[PDB]
Design a protein around this ligand. Structure first.
Ligand code: 413
Ligand code: CA
Lengths: 250, 52
């Protein structure tokens, strides 16, 4: 995250850190006690699918304070329409091996109904994006969780206001074209969270961009509203042997 | 009704007449629009801020 601030400990309680062999991979969003939403592209280069870990209640990567809860990722569900090495349909639904325990430091973000998200949440201008990604393009990643308020743009406005991939109906832009504030690659998979009448909801996933905080560009986010039914159906399904599952979309 | 100002609902809205609904872990108040938590850790609320 570029141009943001430290998320005060406990104020981003749905933030997930994904690790592959102990190394930072991506962020994600807790949406109930066993399910995490992330970006499909986080899994493009997975060597061993059995070594994926999700950490909840994380804040400062340099220390253990006892609020952290680690779980193995038992299933990574990716829509049929996602093609590795490309941008469209950039979403993954992760099943944890055991539920996390909700605490002051570990709380799910609400996955909104599609209509509410499209009719109401889509018009809330500012939303929060967060993660332990780069503090500067080509710079070191953050040790403490960072958070950034970014405004959303209608796609035609985003294109008009921008100086490579197509921005599809499965995406939206948010951020600033002046190069001051953005999420970055190390924030991939993390939440874009939208407040409405006292409650916060999942509206986007950190997906892609031309560098980060690049003048003349905005961050691009997966438009979660397109996936609500797909997610809800999968969350009702029985687990299947093997970690990766490709599931039909729609 | 639901497309205009969320049909007045705090959370979810269905056209039928209009019915507001609340996420799991909340219940709808007698005003027919407001949602109140029914559990200790409802989604989308930040406990340390809810405390103050
Ligand atoms: C998914 O997709 C993608 C992604 C990326 C990134 N991310 C991001 C960025 C930015 C941002 C902002 N700015 N906000 C966010 C996020 C990232 O993630 N990166 C990484 C590497 O490189 O390795 C990856 C990729 C892909 C797959 C896997 C992994 C990068 C890139 C891409 O795509 C491609 C392109 C885009 C744009 C321009 C050009 C190209
Ligand atoms: Ca820690």
């Amino acid at each position: 995250i570029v141009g943001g601030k430290v998320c005060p400990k406990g104020e981003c309680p749905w933030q997930v850190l994904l690790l592959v062999n102990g190394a930072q991979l991506c962020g994600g969003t807790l949406i109930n006690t066993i399910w995490v939403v992330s970006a499909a592209h986080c899994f493009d280069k997975i060597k061993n699918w059995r070594n994926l870990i999700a950490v909840l209640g994380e804040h400062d990567l340099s220390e253990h304070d006892g609020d952290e809860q680690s779980r193995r990722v038992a299933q990574v569900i990716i829509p049929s329409t996602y093609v590795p090495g490309t941008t469209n349909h950039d979403i993954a639904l992760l099943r944890l091996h055991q539920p996390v325990v909700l605490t002051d430091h570990v709380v799910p973000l609400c996955l909104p109904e599609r209509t509410f998200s499209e009719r109401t949440l889509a018009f809330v201008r500012f939303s929060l994006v967060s993660g332990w990604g780069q503090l500067l393009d080509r710079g070191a990643t953050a040790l403490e969780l960072m958070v950034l308020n970014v405004p959303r743009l209608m796609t035609q406005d985003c294109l008009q206001q921008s100086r490579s991939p197509n921005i599809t109906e499965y995406m939206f832009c948010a951020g600033y074209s002046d190069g001051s504030k953005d999420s970055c690659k190390g924030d991939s998979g993390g939440p874009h969270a939208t407040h409405y009448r006292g409650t916060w909801y999942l509206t986007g996933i950190v997906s892609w961009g031309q560098g980060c905080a690049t003048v003349g560009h905005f961050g691009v986010y997966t438009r979660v509203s397109q996936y609500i039914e797909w997610l809800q159906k999968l969350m009702r399904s029985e687990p299947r042997p093997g970690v990766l599952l490709r599931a039909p979309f729609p | 009704i639901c497309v205009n100002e969320n049909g007045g609902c705090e959370q979810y809205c269905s056209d039928h007449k209009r019915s507001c609904r609340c996420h799991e872990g909340y219940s709808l108040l007698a005003d027919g629009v407001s949602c109140t938590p029914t559990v200790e850790y409802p989604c989308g609320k930040i406990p340390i801020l809810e405390k103050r």
